[PDB]
Assembly symmetry: C3
Homo-oligomer: 194 residues x 3
């Protein structure tokens, strides 16, 4: 079962929303660790559930690696208002954030370290690759494959059956209308390589 | 009252989400009919509620006609998280799909065979024409008239008071800013004839 | 505590949705005042909570001023499905509308007379200026400052950390990607001065 307290690493803005989700899940206390100007991570800390509240995908992956290596459990934070299909797969204890009013439909799969931000939608049979960030209000239609480390900006979307290659960025408001097997930064409606 | 079981015609991706909505409504068993590589529709089937889980508007209308002609009741599937104004009108037993977190505001009207997909919004006093599909995250502002058989793509929107003519397509991410009395395919921000 | 009845000023479309929110909050009766072709406002009316259901920001501010001057309390109408962070600040008894499925995240501030329309999202640490209208499905990313009297159109968004100057309009579907210190009308993806 979940611990009484939770370490949230990242005490910035993203950290504050993560705190709200942890409290929603029933955690009694959130202990912020921030190496910058709060309490530092220490490998010697008393054991509690961890969460990595870092928006940057590259840095979130590295921190995730360092925390995991010290034997800490990095839990998922999933708001109770997120609607997740009984046939969707969400990787267990994998540092995944699922914000309020997120919807994940039948047979979608969410990989480790993903952020599904506020009111995002992952349609049936999607695969969202590890340490991707689907940001506020971004939506993936049915059967969309998002590669590892991808970032879908605010209010972006991807049409059905499409793939976005690892390490790509879909800009805020962009509409991806063609399959993308080579990485890049895509902006506009329709989305075009920058 | 609803039957114990339901026939869902279409066993594809759209079918899977329809299954989830039926289960949410309290149906105990979903029986998939798919003429393609599952159990075939037969006019001789034992009577249960039917739903037509076909995304294509033209084909959904034809199947709806064939099922209705055999005397089957084609129910609405409405997720419990959909928020529907007490003054909105949703045509009864009319094969309408209303997905999670859909909002339908005061005095809007939804006609037979419509799909309102995940997190779509139908504002006050809208009329959504029969066998239209308002897809994931698409939004109609107040007093918008969507014609029969129309398709609003992912994350599209229509400004207040506007009409979209029968058999039109508003592309993914498109923003309709002018009245459209002649049918077509409209894409972009602002939306322009293709 | 809230009164038994409420005066809703504006009996148009916006008024109808306001009625729905008031009923959701537990008000027993909504009394429409419309100077146009319903019951007129009178300074002599029996005291009840008031709400100003006027979509136009300029007119809503003026009416708000006139009603306040006569000593009436102009309450907030907040749908129960709106998700508001315990650390967000919503100005009390300030004529604010918060529609269904609105999300307001940690430390955001909402000022008097604001409309947050259906399924809009205000991310952590935003400031939404008085008598602004964030319309249906519009989303502000973290740390966004919206000026007084601003109007964000249907399905628009603003990227993190940005400001929109007082009295500006972000058009339906627009994506604001740069800081804006001078007022104007911005349209497109990316949003550009009209
Ligand atoms: C696409 C993006 C990654 C590019 O950022 P960048 O490399 O720093 O680019 P700049 O901001 O300097 O702008 C470069 C050009 O691209 C354009 N551009 C930037 N973002 C754009 C967008 N999303 N849509 C269309 N054009 C965009 C700019 O207008 C500019 O055009 P110009 O040279 O003609 O003036 C960034 O703008 C973005 O959309 N990030 C998303 C952030 C987000 O959604 N946060 C999550 C919140 S929940
Ligand atoms: C508009 C649409 C119907 C047109 O599809 P199509 O006729 O097969 O057109 P194509 O995909 O071959 O593209 C033709 C051109 O239109 C453009 N285009 C296609 N969709 C576009 C969109 N939504 N916005 C802007 N441009 C678009 C393409 O970029 C292409 O431009 P080009 O010739 O300069 O390279 C389709 O792209 C679409 O948006 N359908 C929506 C699907 C959807 O939302 N599914 C529901 C999920 S919930
Ligand atoms: C931006 C806006 C304020 C401008 O309206 P306007 O001054 O009356 O302008 P017009 O409608 O006459 O159009 C003027 C031009 O701007 C364009 N335009 C208007 N709205 C646009 C939009 N949101 N995106 C891109 N272009 C837009 C028009 O296509 C037109 O282009 P053209 O001259 O090449 O033909 C208005 O279109 C708008 O987006 N308002 C939002 C309404 C809304 O969202 N309601 C709330 C519902 S919840």
């Amino acid at each position: 079962a979940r611990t009484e307290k939770i370490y949230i690493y990242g005490a910035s803005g993203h950290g504050l929303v993560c705190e709200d989700v942890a409290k929603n899940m029933g955690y009694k206390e959130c202990i912020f660790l921030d190496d910058f100007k709060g309490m530092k991570f220490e490998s010697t800390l008393p054991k509690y559930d961890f969460f990595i509240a870092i928006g940057n995908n590259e840095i979130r992956k590295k921190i995730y690696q360092k925390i995991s290596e010290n034997g800490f459990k990095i839990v998922n934070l999933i708001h109770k208002s997120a609607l997740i299909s009984p046939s969707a797969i969400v990787e267990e204890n994998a540092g995944i954030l699922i914000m309020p009013y997120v919807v994940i439909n039948a047979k979608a799969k969410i990989e480790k370290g993903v952020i599904l931000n506020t009111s995002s939608v992952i349609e049936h049979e999607c695969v969202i690759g590890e340490f991707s960030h689907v940001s506020v209000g971004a939506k993936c239609a049915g059967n969309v494959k998002i590669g590892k480390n991808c970032f879908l900006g605010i209010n972006s979307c991807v049409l059905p059956n499409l793939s976005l290659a690892d390490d790509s960025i879909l800009g805020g408001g962009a509409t991806l209308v063609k399959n993308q097997d080579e990485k890049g930064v895509f902006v506009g409606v329709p989305a075009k390589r920058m």
